[PDB]
Structure formats: structure tokens, C-alpha cells
């Protein structure tokens, strides 16, 4: 163990990723969410009850990355300056985690929150995706550790990030998504980093081992995606937006692969996202004698 000199650096990104991920740091008490109450109320019995469940789903992921997700990727990082970034991400996930509970308190009641919490505990496809990543985390394979995480960071959050987004495209719960967008922008980075750091340990690998990794990613994605279709088919059942979420995922699946040096898989007739949703993803001195003039 040697101390950190943030002056003799190994990789460019360590610093600029540290400069971003800390600039855009945020807290959930900073967003006026009490103003979404009126739009919240207008959502149906079924509609409200969904929005709760997807955030609860969002929670699980964010929680995993915090305690077992990012932590495990420290053991694989090369530059001592990467781990410092890693610790920030670890923390940040937990702020992502605090947020929903800051929503949950504000918009709904623990009569509705607790029924969605207990569903989340028992809901088969949500726990499955939580399981897939976990079995690849505690695995001793370091390259697959990153892929999994990328697939979490770049794709898994987005089966649920669609609803606070879609709403925003209707003028409902704008400020809830306003807060979500800050999560998003942090998780965008997360994907690029671990991804970039994946390609890195990858170009160092065996030429023949590079086929092994390329297939497995697609396979794992293909499984995680399979699950995700059944995950969206259950929650969003009785709304009929499935076709938009199932399209969103595809787009968000290319997003993951393109961060890992891999080429897109779903053609843009499957990743066809409505531009409105795409849009919702992001919107002293002195004087002079002279100056005095006239």
C-alpha cells in the first residue's frame, strides 16, 4: 500500500472522471418534490401503485452496486487513483438509494410503499436479475465482473427509468424525473468508466480469449434481457406501454455494448425510441478610465 499522489497519474480518465463524478454530486433534499404531489394524485390507483413498484425495483439495483457491486471492482482496478473514484461511486449509489425513500416519503404512504416493498422481495424476475450479477460478483472472474456491472449500470436501471421519464414527457411529475436525471447522468459515467476499464484489461489479454469474452457478454445480455422482458411484461401490464419500454431496453442494451467496445445488437427498428422520451433523458472586476469615456 502506497499513498495517493494525485499528481503523478497513470491514466487520463482517473482524474477527469473524478472531476465530473464529484462536480455533479447532488442530494435528494435539493429537489422540490412536494410540487409533484398534484400530478401524483391524478395518476390512477393502478398508475400510482406502479410508479411505486418500479422505484422499489430501482432501489434494489442501486443498493447492490453500493455494498457488493462497486466494492468488488476495487480488487480489479489497476491505478491506485481508480479505487478513489470507485469509492465515490459506491457512496453515490447510496444517495441514489436515499432518493426513492425521499420520494416515497413525499408522494405516497407506507401503506402503499410496504405492499410494493414486500412484492419486490417476492417478485421472481426482479430478484433474478439481482441474483445474476451477484453470482458473477462473488465469482473470481474479474473481466466478467465488469461486463455484468456495465450491464447493470448501463441497462438494468432503464427498465424502470422509463416511467419517471415518460411522465416528464407529459408534464406530469416533472420534478421527480428532474431528480432522476441526476441519477441517470451519474450512471452514464459509471457505465463508460468500468466499460473503458474493461476494454483495457481486454486488449492486454490473449488473442483467442477475446472470442470467449465477446460471446459471453451477448449471452449474459441475452439472459438479462430475457428476464427484463418478463420484468416489464409484469409491472407495466395493464398500461399498454410495454412496446415502448421493450424498445427502450434495446436502445439501452446497445448503450451497454457500445461502452464495452462491442458493436450494437438490436437494429433501430427494435431500439426505436420516441424522441420525446429521448429528450427527457436530458434537457466581478474593476472599471476603466476609458470605460468612463463620456
Amino acid at each position: 500500500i502506497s499513498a495517493i499522489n494525485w499528481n503523478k497519474i497513470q491514466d487520463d480518465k482517473d482524474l477527469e472522471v473524478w472531476n465530473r463524478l464529484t462536480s455533479n454530486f447532488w442530494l435528494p433534499e435539493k429537489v422540490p418534490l412536494s410540487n409533484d404531489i398534484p400530478a401524483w394524485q391524478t395518476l390512477s390507483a393502478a398508475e400510482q401503485q406502479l410508479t411505486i413498484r418500479v422505484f422499489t425495483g430501482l432501489t434494489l439495483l442501486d443498493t447492490i452496486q453500493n455494498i457488493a457491486g462497486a466494492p468488488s471492482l476495487m480488487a480489479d482496478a489497476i491505478t491506485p487513483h481508480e479505487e478513489a473514484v470507485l469509492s465515490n461511486i459506491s457512496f453515490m449509489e447510496a444517495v441514489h438509494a436515499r432518493s426513492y425513500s425521499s420520494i416515497f416519503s413525499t408522494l405516497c404512504q407506507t401503506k402503499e410503499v410496504d405492499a410494493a416493498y414486500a412484492w419486490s422481495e417476492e417478485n421472481p424476475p426482479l430478484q433474478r436479475k439481482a441474483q445474476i450479477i451477484l453470482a458473477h460478483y462473488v465469482s473470481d472472474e474479474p473481466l466478467k465482473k465488469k461486463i455484468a456491472s456495465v450491464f447493470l449500470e448501463s441497462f438494468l436501471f432503464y427498465s424502470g427509468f422509463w416511467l419517471p421519464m415518460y411522465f416528464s414527457s407529459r408534464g406530469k411529475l416533472t420534478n421527480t424525473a428532474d431528480l432522476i436525471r441526476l441519477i441517470i447522468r451519474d450512471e452514464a459515467v459509471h457505465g463508460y468508466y468500468i466499460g473503458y476499464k474493461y476494454q483495457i484489461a481486454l486488449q492486454k489479454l490473449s488473442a483467442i480469449e477475446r472470442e470467449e469474452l465477446k460471446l459471453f457478454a451477448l449471452d449474459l445480455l441475452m439472459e438479462l434481457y430475457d428476464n427484463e422482458i418478463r420484468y416489464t411484461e409484469a409491472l407495466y401490464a395493464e398500461t399498454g406501454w410495454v412496446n415502448d419500454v421493450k424498445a427502450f431496453l434495446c436502445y439501452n442494451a446497445n448503450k451497454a455494448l457500445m461502452n464495452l467496445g462491442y458493436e450494437a445488437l438490436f437494429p433501430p427498428e427494435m431500439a426505436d425510441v420516441n424522441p420525446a422520451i429521448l429528450a427527457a433523458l436530458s434537457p466581478t472586476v474593476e472599471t476603466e478610465d476609458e470605460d468612463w469615456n463620456f
Binding site: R170, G171, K172, A279, T284, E286, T287, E288, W292
Partner: protein
């Protein structure tokens, strides 16, 4: 399903593939608002007869008004309104009207008025019974031309009402009586909902002696403290304090905002700039040592003119500060907390027509009038009732005015309606105001939608053809106001007191309008007035009017003033003041969702190159336009400068210099890009 007007309005923040705005969803939201809120909440009446009757007997409307007309003619007028064909323009409009303006029940669950109703009531209140005039106002507010200020519109005709006009300018004198009275004056005025400004200029400096015994007085700061607390008490509820740039406290007066809810306004004389030119020092003269030696209160002497002499007089204690750094600190504080507002003493006086010297401005830098000190016995009663200033306001929709050909009628009806307000304004709580408003007939006819209109007729803002219109516009409004005012005096058989000394009486006011430059400098402009059916006043109209005044006088002291229209602009669909829009779609913190969106008037996906947002149109351009107005309007004009968050002190100071030199009467506060 589900498209609540509030989610529908929100759709104004979103686009399509070419770069579109969804205006569609606004007018759609209005249609929604009337059917999700308004008509399910209003109460139905068989005929206006019950409507009038029940609303009198139940204790909402005031009979004191109607009884001045044949009850026949009241329902005659009401019908005329509800058939005028008024629909709404913006979502915010109808939102603002209904929630804030319209008459609802005592418990507050049902609506009792609609737009066309509120007009009728005001039209009947202002006309005092004049059948022929009651009609005219109804038409003029309904067609959207004349628009009474927030308090006037709101309150008229209601029995359970507040005050007709908020906005007051009362000076404090350098004695405990007047200080006291002033601290009370706040209490009685702020509780009725008033916006009061005070003239601190007169009071003893810090370290000044009281009762012959040396180093005693607290300064101007602790007098504020009390006033602040008084405003803090009486809620609605906001105050401003004006100080002369050459009062010895100025820096520790500026330092208070470096004392939360008060507004600072600094009166800067020409000599301050002149000192600031050659990097020199300033002189701050003791208000006490002026009183003794020159037998006049500080705020009442020509600081610019005397200056040399003052500095020479050894009995007057001079305090020295840095001119360059003054303008600096001024900027510093504006950067942060908005004010200090500025008004340029001499600039104002120079082109003031009324006898005397102005010293201060209102809470919004727009009202500029002369006043006299009030003298009190030890029991706080008036041994000499002075004159202080109250501001009756109302504005015109530049565009809507330009459409109808009888711009004259459009103006008279408005000036008369405005005048009517003073003849009904009896603030007994502070007599100087009331007795001043009893001799002055002070009014302030405003404008709005200039930007809307220019850009509607296709003119870019700040352009050589823009200024050219706005100049020859004010020119022609002015003529009609003065005419309306001259006529009024002829009918009442009395001029405002102090007229015999006015420049209108001397006729050196008419001096300007008897020369030229008064023919259009651009063909595009001339087209407008040709096309609009407006006869631009010709030399022998002024020449006929000069000699008219010089016989019968004018009934009003000060005629126009252009305010920074608050909510009234959103009811009448107008681009704020006579300045550019703050943005293409104004985001405003209101009601349930915490924000309501406002699209600029006459805006489509086609003319979007006209609606350049203020911030980046630039400072200079705004002044440039305002200059042309400052030319004609006898009072001040509320000038708000719009800088980018990256701009620096210099920029501001540089912009103020220009503004100063261009001859701006008054400056409001400076806004930075950050929302």
C-alpha cells in the same frame, strides 16, 4: 386518459424534430381549465337581475356604485360585455385572473364573476355614473386596450374590498415627530396592502450631534430597522428606502445588503459621474450642517449645482469616499441582491415640467414626482400638511391600441378612467398623501406589449426602425393625454394646484414638440401609422394645444408613467414592459405544480427570430428604446437590465454610464441568467 390542464401547460417546455414549440397544448389547456376547474365551480344565475340582486343582498358587491345608474342600464351594459365575444389568450391568463383577481365566495369554493363581469364592475366604478363613459371603459378593457393596475382592477365594485391603489411615496423629515409618523405611516399603509417608499435623504448622518450636544445620532440605518419591522408586521407587505448618493452614510447604507426585506434606491447626481471620471473622490455633506447654514433640508438642494460652494463652506462637514469604488460597490450589491435601484437626480429635474425638485422614487423606480415637507405639533398632528405622492396606475396594450383607429378615444377613456381613481383615492391614514393627491391629480398611464407589437409587425428589437416606432409612438400618446388633461380642466373649471409655475403654463414644455424630428425616420414605421389609421400629431395640433393649456390649464400634474407591469401583463397578454421578453416561454413559480408557463404573444413557429430573449439582446439596446420613451414620459420608466451570469462589475457600471448619458430618468434592478 388524464390530461390535467397543468400537465397540458407543461407541454410548452418540449419540442419536435425541426425545433418546434407546442403552442397547441396551451390553448388546449385553457379549454381544459374552464372544464376541470371554472364552470363546475361557478354558480348559475337565471338573469343578471338576480345576479345583481343576490350579490348585493348577500354582501359581496357594492350598491354604492350601481345606484348611480338606471338599474336598467346596468343589465344593459352587462349584456354588452358577455356579448363582446371575449375569449382567453394564455393559460396563465385565465389562471391568474381566476385565482387572484375574480370575485369568489366568502368561504372560497365557488366563482361569482367572470372576466367580462370584472370589467363591467370596474367600468361602472370608474365612471361614477356616466352612462356614455361606463360603456367606453367596458369596451376598452375588453378589447384588451386599456388595463387598470392590479389593485384597481381587482378591487372596483366589490363591497368587501381593499384599496384602489397600492403604491406610496412619503418622505421622512429630520425630526422625531416625522420619523414617528412615518413609522406609523407604514403600519396604516402596509396593512391596507401598500407599497411604500421613504426618503431617508433628510435625516442626520451617523456621528451627528442632537440637541446641540455632539456625536449622537444613529444614522439612517436604524430608522430603516423600524420600517422593516413595520412592513414585516403589516401584510402584500413590502417597502423601499431611498437615499442620496451624497449622504454621509451611503456606504453603510449600501452595506446593509452586503435588514432583509427592504429595498434600496440610490439617487445619483451628475457630479458623481464627473468625479468618477477623473478617478477622484466624492464629497458627502452632513445633512445637519446644510440645515443650519443653508436653511434647507438636504434632500431639497441642488447637490450638483452647489457642490463647489458646499465644498468651500467650512461649516458644512464634508466626508470623502471613492467615486470609482462607489459605482463599484453599487454594482457589487446589484449583482447579488438586485437593488440598489437608481434614479439620476438632475437628469430627472432637467426635464421635469412641474415646479420644484424631485428627490425620490417608488418601489419600482417608475414613479417620479415633486413633494413638500410636512410639519407636526408634538402630538403628531399636522401643523402644516405637506404633500407626498400616491400613484394611480393603468397601462395600454401597444399592439391593441395600434389596431383601433380612434387612438384618441382609446387614450381619453384611459386617462379619464385613471383620473377618476385619484378623485376616489382618499387615504385618510396619512393626510399629506391624501391632500397632495387632492391638489395634484397625479396619474401614470403606462404601456406594454411593445416587444410583442414590434415583433408582430416584424421589427427586430433595438433596431434603427424599432426605436423609430417607439419614439413616434410615445410622442402621439403624449399629445392625446395632454389633450385629454386640458379638456378635463376645461370641464371641471380647475387646474392642478402649482400649475401657474409649471412649464406647461410657461409653455417651455411645448417648446420640444414645436420643432422637428417628428416625422418617421424609417419607411417601415410610416407604414404602420398609415396602415393603422393613426394620424401622427402635426405642428398646428400642438400649436393649437399650447394655447389651449395656456388658458384652461391641465387638470393633472403628471400624466404618464410606465411601470414594470406585474401580473397585469399576463391578464392582458403583453410582453412585460416596453422592454424585451425575459425568455421565449416565461417560467413562473405559481400554484399547485410550482410553475406555470407563459408563451409570448403573437408567437408562432415562424417568427421565432423576432422573440430574441432579453438577456442576449443586450443592455445597450434596451436603454436605446427606453431613451425614446424617456423623451416623452414626464415621470420615470422602470428599466431592468438583463446580464449573463458571467458578466462582471464593469459591464454593469459601463451599462449604467451609457444609460446615464443616454439620459435615462430611472433604473430598476439588474437580473442575471439563472433559472
Amino acid at each position: 386518459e388524464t390530461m390535467d390542464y397543468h400537465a397540458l401547460n407543461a407541454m410548452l417546455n418540449l419540442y419536435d424534430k425541426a425545433g418546434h414549440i407546442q403552442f397547441d397544448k396551451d390553448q388546449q389547456a385553457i379549454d381544459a381549465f374552464f372544464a376541470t376547474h371554472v364552470r363546475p365551480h361557478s354558480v348559475t344565475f337565471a338573469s343578471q337581475h338576480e345576479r345583481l340582486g343576490t350579490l348585493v343582498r348577500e354582501g359581496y358587491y357594492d350598491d354604492a356604485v350601481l345606484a348611480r345608474y338606471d338599474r336598467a342600464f346596468v343589465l344593459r351594459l352587462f349584456e354588452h360585455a358577455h356579448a363582446s365575444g371575449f375569449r382567453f389568450q394564455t393559460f396563465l391568463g385565465a389562471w391568474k385572473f381566476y385565482t387572484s383577481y375574480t370575485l369568489k365566495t366568502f368561504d372560497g369554493k365557488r366563482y361569482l364573476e367572470h372576466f367580462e363581469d370584472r370589467v363591467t364592475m370596474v367600468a361602472l366604478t370608474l365612471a361614477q355614473g356616466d352612462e356614455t363613459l361606463a360603456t367606453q371603459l367596458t369596451d376598452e378593457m375588453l378589447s384588451g386596450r386599456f388595463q387598470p393596475a392590479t389593485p384597481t382592477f381587482l378591487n372596483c365594485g366589490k363591497q368587501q374590498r381593499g384599496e384602489l391603489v397600492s403604491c406610496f411615496l412619503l418622505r421622512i423629515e429630520d425630526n422625531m415627530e416625522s420619523i414617528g409618523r412615518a413609522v406609523n405611516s407604514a403600519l396604516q399603509l402596509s396593512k391596507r396592502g401598500g407599497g411604500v417608499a421613504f426618503l431617508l435623504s433628510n435625516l442626520r448622518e451617523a456621528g451627528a450631534p442632537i440637541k446641540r450636544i455632539e456625536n449622537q445620532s444613529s444614522g439612517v440605518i436604524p430608522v430603516m430597522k423600524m420600517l422593516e419591522d413595520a412592513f414585516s408586521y403589516a401584510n402584500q407587505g413590502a417597502g423601499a428606502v431611498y437615499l442620496h448618493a451624497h449622504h454621509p452614510d451611503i456606504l453603510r447604507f449600501l452595506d446593509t445588503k452586503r435588514i432583509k426585506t427592504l429595498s434600496l434606491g440610490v439617487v445619483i447626481p451628475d457630479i458623481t459621474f464627473r468625479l468618477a471620471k477623473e478617478n477622484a473622490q466624492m464629497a458627502l455633506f452632513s445633512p445637519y450642517d446644510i440645515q443650519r447654514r443653508y436653511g434647507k433640508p438636504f434632500g431639497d438642494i441642488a447637490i450638483s449645482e452647489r457642490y463647489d460652494e458646499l465644498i468651500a463652506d467650512p461649516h458644512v462637514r464634508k466626508t470623502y469616499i471613492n467615486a470609482r469604488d462607489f459605482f463599484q460597490t453599487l454594482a457589487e450589491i446589484q449583482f447579488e441582491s438586485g437593488y440598489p435601484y437608481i434614479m439620476f437626480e438632475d437628469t430627472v429635474n432637467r426635464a421635469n415640467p412641474i415646479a420644484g425638485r424631485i428627490n425620490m422614487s417608488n418601489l419600482c423606480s417608475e414613479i417620479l414626482q415633486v413633494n413638500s415637507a410636512s410639519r407636526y405639533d408634538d402630538n403628531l398632528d399636522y401643523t402644516h400638511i405637506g404633500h407626498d405622492i400616491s400613484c394611480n396606475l393603468g397601462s395600454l396594450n401597444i399592439a391593441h391600441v395600434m389596431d383601433s383607429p380612434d387612438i384618441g378615444r382609446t387614450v381619453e377613456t384611459a386617462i379619464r378612467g385613471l383620473t377618476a381613481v385619484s378623485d376616489m383615492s382618499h387615504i385618510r391614514s396619512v393626510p399629506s398623501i391624501a391632500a397632495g393627491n387632492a391638489a395634484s391629480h397625479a396619474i401614470g398611464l403606462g404601456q406594454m406589449n411593445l416587444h410583442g407589437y414590434l415583433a408582430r409587425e416584424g421589427i427586430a428589437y433595438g433596431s434603427p426602425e424599432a426605436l423609430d416606432f417607439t419614439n413616434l409612438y410615445f410622442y402621439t400618446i403624449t399629445w392625446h393625454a395632454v389633450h385629454t388633461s386640458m379638456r378635463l380642466a376645461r370641464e371641471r373649471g380647475k387646474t392642478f394646484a402649482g400649475f401657474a409655475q409649471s412649464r406647461y403654463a410657461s409653455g417651455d414644455y411645448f417648446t420640444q414638440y414645436l420643432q422637428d424630428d417628428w416625422q418617421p425616420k424609417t419607411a417601415k414605421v410610416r407604414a404602420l401609422f398609415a396602415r393603422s389609421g393613426i394620424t401622427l400629431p402635426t405642428r398646428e395640433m400642438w400649436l393649437k394645444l399650447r394655447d389651449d393649456v395656456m388658458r384652461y390649464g391641465i387638470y393633472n400634474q403628471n400624466l404618464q408613467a410606465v411601470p414594470p407591469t406585474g401580473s397585469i401583463s399576463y391578464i392582458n397578454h403583453a410582453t412585460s414592459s416596453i422592454h424585451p421578453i425575459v425568455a421565449k416561454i416565461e417560467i413562473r413559480k405559481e400554484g399547485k405544480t410550482g410553475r406555470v408557463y407563459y408563451p409570448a404573444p403573437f408567437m408562432t413557429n415562424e417568427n421565432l427570430d423576432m422573440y430574441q430573449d432579453a438577456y442576449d439582446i443586450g443592455p445597450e439596446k434596451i436603454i436605446d428604446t427606453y431613451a425614446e420613451a424617456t423623451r416623452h414620459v414626464d415621470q420615470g420608466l422602470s428599466l431592468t437590465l438583463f446580464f449573463p451570469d458571467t458578466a462582471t462589475t464593469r459591464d454593469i457600471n459601463k451599462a449604467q454610464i451609457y444609460a446615464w448619458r443616454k439620459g435615462i430618468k430611472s433604473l430598476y434592478y439588474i437580473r442575471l441568467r439563472q433559472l
